[PDB]
Amino acid sequence: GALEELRGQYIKAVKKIKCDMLRYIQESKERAAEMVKAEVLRERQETARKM
Amino acid sequence: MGALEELRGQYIKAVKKIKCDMLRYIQESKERAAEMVKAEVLRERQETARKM
Amino acid sequence: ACLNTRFLEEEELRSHHILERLDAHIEELKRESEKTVRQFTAL
Amino acid sequence: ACLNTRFLEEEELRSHHILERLDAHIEELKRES
């Protein structure tokens, strides 16, 4: 009844909080992965040097 | 009445733990990012050595 | 190079762990609240 | 460096944002409670 519904709301509210943190953490990984490409591209400047 | 306070208390505790976890995760992530700044200034030693 | 890839691999590991801790705080909420409901519903 | 300093800057901004909106959402449901 009222108590079980109130429970479902608190549960659904925290799960939303979890979704926000998830999207954030996924964006973390993408950013650190984008770093990888960025470092590979500055190696390009040094391999032009070596030619 | 007391059930309402309990359920409210349990929600608050859940989210306050999530915030504590994110606070520590973030502080750790920024230190790891700062460590990546040091480690690479040190990689210019190889460049400045090449320049010597 | 290998600083950043190893950085990412670390990120991946920390991503899984913080994820566990969030699922924990949720599962604990589900158990605590289910008990509050069950017992007050007996009233 | 300017790569990784640019990186640390942005994580500062986006981590502050995530904490802001979370502190908002706790203030939200407690005032709803």
Author numbering:
A (entry chain B): 1205 to 1255
B (entry chain D): 1204 to 1255
C (entry chain C): 498 to 540
D (entry chain A): 498 to 530
What text comes from the article?
However, our effort to determine the crystal structure of the P1•M4d complex was unsuccessful because of heavy precipitation caused by the hydrophobic motifs within P1 and M4d. As expected, a smaller Cep63 P1b5(502–541)•Cep152 M4e15(1205–1257) complex lacking the hydrophobic motifs maintained its 2:2 heterotetrameric state (expected MW 25.56 kDa) without forming any detectable high MW complex. Size-exclusion chromatography-multi-angle light scattering (SEC-MALS) performed with decreasing concentrations of the complex revealed an apparent biphasic mode of MW changes, suggesting that the heterotetramer dissociates in two distinct steps with estimated Kd values of ~117 μM and ~60 μM. In particular, identical hydrophobic residues in the parallelly aligned Cep152 helices appeared to constitute the backbone of the bundle by engaging in pairwise ladder-like interactions (top). Cep63 helices did not directly interact with each other, but rather interacted with both Cep152 helices in an antiparallel fashion (middle and bottom).
The centrosome, which plays a central role as the main microtubule (MT)-organizing center for animal cell division, is a membraneless organelle composed of a pair of orthogonally arranged MT-derived apparatus, called centrioles, and the surrounding pericentriolar material (PCM). Here, we demonstrate that two of the human PCM scaffolds, Cep63 and Cep15212–14, cooperate to generate a higher-order cylindrical self-assembly capable of recruiting their downstream components, such as Plk4, a key regulator of centriole duplication. Here we showed that two centrosomal scaffolds, Cep63 and Cep152, cooperatively interact with each other to generate a heterotetrameric α-helical bundle, which in turn self-assembles into a higher-order cylindrical architecture that resembles the localization morphology of endogenous Cep152 detected around a centriole. Remarkably, short (~50 residues) coiled-coil heterotetramerization regions of Cep63 and Cep152 and their neighboring hydrophobic motifs (i.e., Cep63 P1 and Cep152 M4d) were necessary and sufficient to generate the cylindrical self-assembly capable of recruiting its guest molecules critical for centriole duplication in vivo.
